Structure formats: C-alpha cells, structure tokens
Write a protein that binds this ligand. Structure first.
Ligand SMILES: CCOC(=O)CC[C@H](C[C@@H]1CCNC1=O)NC(=O)[C@@H](CC(=O)[C@@H](NC(=O)c1cc(C)on1)C(C)C)Cc1ccc(F)cc1
Length: 182
C-alpha cells in the first residue's frame, strides 16, 4: 500500500526506465554502474531504445542462479553517459516475499504506473510458455502483456521482476543481491 508505493516512487526517476526492443515495450530496472535487468523475453540486441534515445548495448548475459537455473532475466550493460544510482542495498540478501507490494510499470504505453498487486507469496517452480524456472513468486492480480520487466517492491526492498501471468495472477522472478555481484 502507501509505504511500498512511496518507496516505489523513489525508484522511478533514477532507476526505472522505459525501453523498447524488437519484441516490444518493457520496463527496465537499472541497478548500478551501467548495469540493468530485463526479462529474457525482451531479447535485447545491439541497440535498445531507452526513453527517447537509441542506446548501444555493451553486452547482455542471461541471469542463471547458483543452482544452474535460468531465471528468465538478462543482465544488460549499456553505453550510457551516466551511471545508475546504485540500488544494490535495496535488493535483499535473501529472496523475499512481502505483504501489500507495489508493481512499478514504466513503458511508453504504460508510463509511470504503480499497480497495487497485494500480497506476493512463494510460488517456486514455474513453467512459462514451456520454459521452466524456479524461485518465482506470485500475486493474485490480473497482470497484462506490456508489464514484463515491471519492478515488484516491498516497503523498502526490490523483490522481483514481473515475467508472466495467466490472466488472473502474475509471477515475478525473485531477486537477491548476489545475482548482481560483479
Ligand atoms: C513482448 C510481449 O510479450 C509480453 O507482453 C511479455 C508480457 C507477458 C506478461 C503476461 C502476459 C499475460 N499476463 C501477464 O502477466 N509475459 C508473457 O507473455 C510470458 C508468457 C506468459 O506469461 C504465459 N503464461 C504462463 O505460461 C503461465 C503459467 C502460469 C502458472 O501462469 N501463467 C501466457 C502468455 C500464457 C512470456 C515468457 C515466455 C517464456 C518465459 F520463459 C518467460 C516469459
């Protein structure tokens, strides 16, 4: 509710970017330095649109956890002029569920949008259009196409990235701090 909403708003300007790839429109969380995270499904190429600018991509590396499981997110590094404000400290050391979370969407079509998704609960194994992953979490909210990459936040942590849904529920890849270690 209110507390996750205001924390979510504090991330928006400095860290939550509108992007476009050949696959469509996505929300992108910048984490630190020139490092950001996107859904694998966005399939970033050699350039990517960020806000109004076509930006060269330094690399895109699929995020695979310490158990060898693809998390369906890719870590992208960018030929941006400025570094992102470092939000490492807001990514929890442990994958975290949360009550009354906020999902932040920021795309050209859904700009600066805060979605009260309610409680985010453990889900675990998830088969997303035939691609299996784990460590996912679920919220009973009817998320939509165009919300992938959306940032799931608690009172003061960034807990997940929206990756899929079935029309009545939504699912995020869980985040923990070690995923972003250099
Ligand atoms: C570029 C445009 O594409 C997009 O908009 C990305 C947006 C949507 C957001 C969905 C869109 C709808 N409700 C939502 O919240 N995401 C996907 O579509 C994903 C597929 C699903 O959500 C599928 N769901 C399940 O499999 C699923 C399983 C359970 C359990 O619940 N849902 C549905 C398409 C059927 C794409 C994907 C494929 C393979 C993966 F490794 C990982 C992801």
């Amino acid at each position: 509710m209110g507390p996750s909403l205001d924390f979510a708003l504090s991330l928006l300007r400095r860290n939550i970017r509108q992007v476009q790839t050949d696959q469509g429109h996505f929300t992108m969380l910048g984490i630190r330095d020139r490092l950001a995270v996107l859904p694998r499904h966005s399939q970033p190429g050699k350039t990517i649109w960020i806000e109004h600018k076509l930006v060269n991509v330094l690399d895109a590396v699929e995020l695979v956890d310490e158990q060898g499981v693809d998390l369906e997110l890719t870590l992208i590094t960018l030929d941006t002029n400025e570094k992102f404000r470092d939000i490492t400290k807001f990514i929890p050391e442990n994958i975290s569920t949360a009550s009354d979370a906020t999902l932040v969407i920021n795309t050209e079509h859904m700009p600066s949008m805060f979605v009260p998704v309610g409680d985010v609960v453990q889900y675990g194994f998830l088969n997303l259009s035939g691609k299996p992953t784990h460590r996912t979490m679920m919220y009973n909210f009817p998320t939509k196409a165009g919300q992938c990459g959306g940032v799931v936040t608690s009172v003061g942590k960034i807990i997940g990235i929206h990756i899929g849904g079935n029309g009545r529920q939504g699912f995020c890849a869980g985040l923990k701090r070690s995923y972003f270690a250099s």
